[PDB]
Structure 1
Amino acid sequence: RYEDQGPLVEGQLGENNELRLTRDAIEPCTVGHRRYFTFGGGYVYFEEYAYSHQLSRADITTVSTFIDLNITMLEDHEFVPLEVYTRHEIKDSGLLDYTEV
């Protein structure tokens, strides 16, 4: 039903959470019939053209169709003031300072 108070409208489920108005999906019946169909956030399992039970999505083994590319940002880095010799050091490296003397 489109709304909670609307009339009940018949049909058949579609693919990926779709609702179809036409019940034309027909085939010859076959032995050993097992089917799964996506429903809400999980699945529904049917056997022999009869409802069997619901399944949570995590209950089914999931295989990755995606290629993992793991890009990690170059972290922030802080360069401290570093000097082999400070100005004063170089000033003091002189054996004598004329000013001080």
Structure 2
Amino acid sequence: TVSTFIDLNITMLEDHEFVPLEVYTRHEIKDSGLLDYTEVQRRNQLHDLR
């Protein structure tokens, strides 16, 4: 068999899922400061009851 047809190949672009990605979370940013003022306050205001 010979053919008079001209081929053409089209495959659909497959699905692709995007997972959530973060370089730094806000908890790491809150921990970036050398002294979280709030936690220092809460610790130091327990001295009499401790």
The residue that corresponds to 1:90 in the other structure is 29
**Superposition CA RMSD, Å:** 1.3
Runs of 4 or more consecutive aligned structure 1 residues displaced over 6 Å after TM superposition: none
Count of aligned residue pairs for this structure pair? 40
5+ long unaligned stretches in structure 2: 41-50
CA distance in 1, matches of 2:32, 2:38: 14
Normalising by structure 2, report the TM-score: 0.63
Instruction: Give the distance between the partners of 1:63 and 1:80, measured in 2 at CA.
Output: 49
Distance in 1 (alpha carbons) for counterparts of 2:14 and 2:37: 49
Deviation of 1:63 (Å): 2.1
Q: Deviations over 1:55-101 (max 9, x none)?
A: xxxxxxx2232222211111111110101111211111111111111
Q: Where do 5+ consecutive residues of structure 1 fail to align?
A: 1-61
CA distance in 2, matches of 1:90, 1:66: 63
Q: Which has the higher strand share?
A: 1
Corresponding residue SS for 2:27: helix
Residue 68 (1) aligns with residue 10 (2): no
**How high is the TM-score relative to the length of structure 1?**
0.36
Q: Hey, which of these two has a bigger chunk of helix by percent?
A: 2
Rg comparison, structure with higher value? 1
Q: What CA deviation, in whole Å up to 9, does each residue of 1:34-68 have, x standing for no partner?
A: xxxxxxxxxxxxxxxxxxxxxxxxxxxx2232222
